[PDB]
Design a protein around this ligand. Structure first.
Ligand SMILES: [Mg+2]
Ligand SMILES: [Mg+2]
Ligand SMILES: [Mg+2]
Lengths: 43, 683
RNA sequence: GUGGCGGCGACGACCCAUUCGAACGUCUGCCCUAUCAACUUUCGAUGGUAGUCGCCGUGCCUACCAUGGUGACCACGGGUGAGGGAAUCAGGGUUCGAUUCCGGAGAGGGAGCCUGAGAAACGGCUACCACAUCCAAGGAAGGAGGCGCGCAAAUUACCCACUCCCGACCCGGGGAGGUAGUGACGAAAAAUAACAAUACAGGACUCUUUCGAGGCCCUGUAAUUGGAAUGAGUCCACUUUAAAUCCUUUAACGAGGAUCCAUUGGAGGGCAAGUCUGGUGCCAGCAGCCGCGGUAGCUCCAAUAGCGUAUAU
């Protein structure tokens, strides 16, 4: 600890998670649902 | 040596949690997550100043390290930081199955090693033991778990499932991580996954509560009026003090009959309030006190706070009060008998719940875990004396409703402020919403539709219901609120059976939906059916054993797991209507899955910014879905006069009644059937 | 031809003898104590017969018998610094020599038990008693010395090269055994210089209660001068040894203020525009790195790598 930052001493998919443009919340907000197999999308 | 910067957001999150006395959640991804716990534990020790943090480790079947000092030595027979961490830190190891042992004690940090085996019962019990600024760490070591995370974040609708059981609860767990305030996903290296959408705005708080301020005011103002003041000084939270004053107010009344009800769920101090209330009665002229519980071993904290109330206000350990212990191997260390002779002669005695006799000369009787005693037994313990009743949240409500109707004075007090941490914790609110362990206090009234004539049953889709969409979440909450409000006991695990268990179907009864309506129709009745036999449960096995019938067991039929009607609408006939619609459906009178991802296509999928694939509808008409042909229908329930009349009217015929009653409810399980083989069984 | 004969070794094996022993006897001989004169039969003391046990002889033990046994020629009883001895070999300037031999017992405390030629085991086990450690609380595993003196490192390190021992073995192993550290209690030997020359002065030295009496082949000078010698130290290489250190050899550097600088105790001399005290105007005592301004290494005596003080005597 230097009072400013921290100093401490499969993978290709992990790299894909880091470079994600849209957050899962914004992905979730744009989602819509339909009821009774035909209706106005509630989302 | 070359060193890597760690993003300050990790340190910012930890420091804010300790200062706010609120826990935070960490989700490590990768097979090297064990080394991540070592770094996260050490950073927690730097922020915390009270003590060296304690670590709770939970695993399902296999632990990589030995956890035995001699054994881990010979396995090694150059230096690993993980080996230092295990030997230095105080770690308590517990199993997923054996999680009941760690219920009472408190730990600084909790580690959930195995993600795929997570169950609602495990989550509620382990997270509760975390205190203050501690960390809850969840690991995703398996490659299957990693790619499930990959598919959801790439496209919210598409999901990956191998081959059996869908496991929607794990997917629902993944989606809910975004909503949580204090959630930080990290990798094998100290790298944050930017998916919660709130991690970007995390900032350090600048360097005490409204409820805590009031308690200090009470602790100063109640020095004037005492010995009620001494017990409040022993109290830790505000809402505990208010219950204490309510108990002593009931004690001082010049009435034979008076009831104070303590209505506090887990995590909030409940036995402590009872213990101080007993000491307050001992402080007064009360002589004969009885304490009732299903087991003497259950009440140990209650007698502790009686001693703390005793120790605070004279009552030396030997010169004033003498305690007689269990002196038995079974139910050991329980203090059944407490005798205090400072003020004339006063005695506190523990008795079995089935001891309506020996209560002839009673002034105060305290009933704890009152829900856990059979219902008829509670009535016998009422009597003409003062009674203290404490029941944990999460019928007993019918009894207190009768007490509101009455003679016996009623006082209702509830606890909402947790002892271990500060109110308003983000982890707790997220945890309860995920498990649906909370019910809305007030339910809006709606118009009553005509009963046996104009309601049609609908088929709820399991896949669409558990998706985290806002409309689906409200509908699931409405169903679950009615699902647990029935006479059936509520358990957090039942949500997993709705979500994961196969051969389970959900049907809901609705009012006639107008062409122009709101987002969600009101639900009147919810019914669950599990298919058995040719299409291995209680109904097939018990009949086969008892009646030694060979041809039976090749028949196909389902049992009604649960049937529910809204309490305001109860007793007017939605329940009978739903059963009739099932029979026409399964007899064939009515004229007759979300996109899965291939194993090799998990990497091939790219980002879809706006979802495109059409989702399966939430509710389906009975005509649209084809029906399976069922020979019979069954139900298993604890035999009660109210339910027996209901099922006989619907055509269900008893075949079996269990010899020994259930321990908790005192009811005999009964099996009924409806369709010439039934004639043989009935005779 | 399911012919017949054969060499040199290894291992095991009944019995006899031998070697190494071990165990019971015979004879001879122990210190002080009589203010211990009697003792033994106080769960056998002496002897006889039969038997048990034991490797064997035997009151060693058990049954049945006799009344025996020892004693002033000291029985019996009690004692006894019973670290100290005892021996051995070798030796010219008196020996600061060397080595060896033991009386038993125990392995947290008393009993029981297992192997072998040899142990009632320097080692396992069971029960009881006493301690203490780990745990998910269910169960599991165990048998010595340092300081208290301003003071805790050998409580270690290297090797089987010597001497010898054990093993299937020429070879392996041995904290048996061998090698290596500090040190004014003390004892012994020894440096810190030696040899020449020049210049300039005129006074040494003994005795002596202030006068004096003797006397000279030299003395003094913090004077100058010269080129020979050497070890304190610094630093190569052999030899040594299981490896290395040490001792003995030995290459090269290493002195004029030779500053490459000996101490401890005792007794004296020298002083200002300086301070204090007391007086006998100008004095005396004590003392003096301190003054007006300025801050960039005197002499003599005793012992000598040794020499004082205090107390008791
Ligand atoms: Mg000397
Ligand atoms: Mg001369
Ligand atoms: Mg010269």
């Amino acid at each position: 600890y230097d009072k400013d930052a921290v100093y401490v001493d499969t993978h290709e998919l992990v790299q894909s998670l880091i470079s994600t443009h849209s957050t899962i919340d914004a992905k979730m907000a744009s989602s819509r649902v339909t009821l009774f197999s035909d209706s106005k999308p509630l989302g | 040596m070359h060193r890597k910067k760690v993003d300050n957001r990790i340190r910012i999150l930890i420091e804010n949690g300790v200062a706010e006395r609120q826990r935070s959640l960490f989700v490590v991804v990768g097979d090297r997550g064990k080394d991540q716990v070592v770094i996260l534990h050490h950073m927690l020790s730097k922020a915390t100043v009270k003590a060296r943090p304690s670590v709770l480790w939970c695993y399902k079947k296999e632990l990589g390290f030995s956890s035995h000092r001699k054994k881990r030595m010979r396995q090694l027979q150059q230096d690993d930081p993980f080996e230092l961490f295990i030997a230095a830190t105080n770690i308590r190891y517990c199993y997923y199955n054996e999680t009941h042992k760690i219920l009472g004690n408190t730990f600084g940090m909790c580690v959930l090693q195995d993600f795929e085996a997570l169950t609602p019962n495990l989550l509620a019990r382990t997270v509760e033991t975390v205190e203050g600024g501690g960390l809850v760490v969840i690991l995703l070591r398996t490659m299957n778990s990693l790619k499930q995370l990959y598919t959801v974040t790439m496209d919210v609708h598409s999901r990956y499932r191998t081959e059996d059981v869908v496991g929607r609860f794990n997917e629902r767990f993944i989606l809910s991580l975004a909503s949580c305030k204090k959630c930080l996903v990290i990798d094998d290296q100290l790298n944050i996954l930017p998916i919660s959408s709130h991690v970007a705005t995390m900032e350090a708080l600048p360097p005490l509560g409204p409820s805590d301020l009031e308690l200090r005011e009470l602790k100063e103002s109640l020095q004037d009026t005492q010995p009620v003041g001494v017990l409040v000084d022993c109290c830790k939270t505000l809402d505990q003090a208010k219950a204490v004053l309510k108990f002593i107010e009931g004690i001082s009344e010049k009435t034979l009959r008076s009831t104070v009800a303590l209505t506090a769920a887990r995590g909030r101090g409940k036995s402590a309030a009872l213990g101080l209330a007993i000491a307050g009665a001992v402080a007064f002229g009360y002589s004969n006190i009885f304490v009732t519980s299903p087991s003497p071993d259950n009440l140990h904290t209650l007698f502790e706070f009686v001693f703390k109330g005793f120790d605070a206000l004279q009552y030396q350990e030997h010169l004033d009060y003498e305690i007689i212990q269990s002196l038995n191997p079974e139910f050991n260390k329980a203090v059944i008998r407490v005798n205090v002779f400072r003020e004339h002669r006063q005695t506190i005695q523990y008795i079995h719940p089935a001891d309506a006799v020996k209560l002839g000369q009673a002034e105060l009787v305290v009933i704890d875990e009152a829900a856990a005693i059979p219902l008829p037994l509670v009535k016998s313990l009422l009597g003409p004396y003062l009674v203290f009743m404490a029941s944990t949240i999460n019928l007993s409500l019918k009894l207190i409703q009768q007490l509101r109707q009455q003679a016996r004075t009623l006082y209702e007090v509830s606890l909402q402020e947790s002892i271990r941490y500060a109110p308003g914790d983000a982890v707790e609110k997220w945890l309860n919403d995920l498990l649906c362990l909370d019910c809305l206090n007030i339910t809006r009234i709606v118009s009553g539709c005509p009963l046996p004539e104009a309601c049609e049953l609908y088929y709820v889709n399991r896949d669409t219901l558990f998706c985290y969409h806002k409309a689906s979440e409200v509908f699931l909450q409405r169903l679950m609120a009615l699902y647990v409000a029935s006479h059936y006991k509520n358990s957090p695990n039942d949500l997993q059976m709705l979500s994961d268990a196969p051969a389970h179907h959900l049907f809901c009864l609705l009012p006639p939906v107008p062409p122009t309506q709101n987002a969600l129709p009101e639900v009147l009745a919810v019914i669950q059916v599990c298919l058995e036999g040719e299409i291995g449960d209680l109904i097939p096995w018990t009949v086969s054993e008892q009646f030694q019938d060979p041809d039976f067991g090749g028949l196909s039929g389902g049992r009604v797991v649960r049937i529910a009607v809204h309490p305001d609408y109860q007793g007017m006939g939605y329940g009978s209507r739903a059963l009739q619609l099932l029979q026409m459906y399964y007899e064939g009178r009515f004229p007759c899955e979300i996109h899965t991802v291939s194993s090799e296509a998990v990497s091939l999928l790219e980002e879809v910014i706006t979802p495109r694939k059409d989702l399966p509808p939430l509710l389906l008409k009975l005509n649209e879905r084809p029906a399976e042909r069922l020979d019979y229908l069954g139900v298993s329930y604890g035999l009660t006069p109210r339910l027996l009349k209901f099922w006989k009217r619907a055509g269900f015929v008893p075949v079996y009644l269990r010899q020994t009653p259930n321990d908790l409810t005192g009811e005999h399980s009964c099996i009924m059937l409806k369709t010439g083989w039934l004639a043989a069984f009935w005779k």
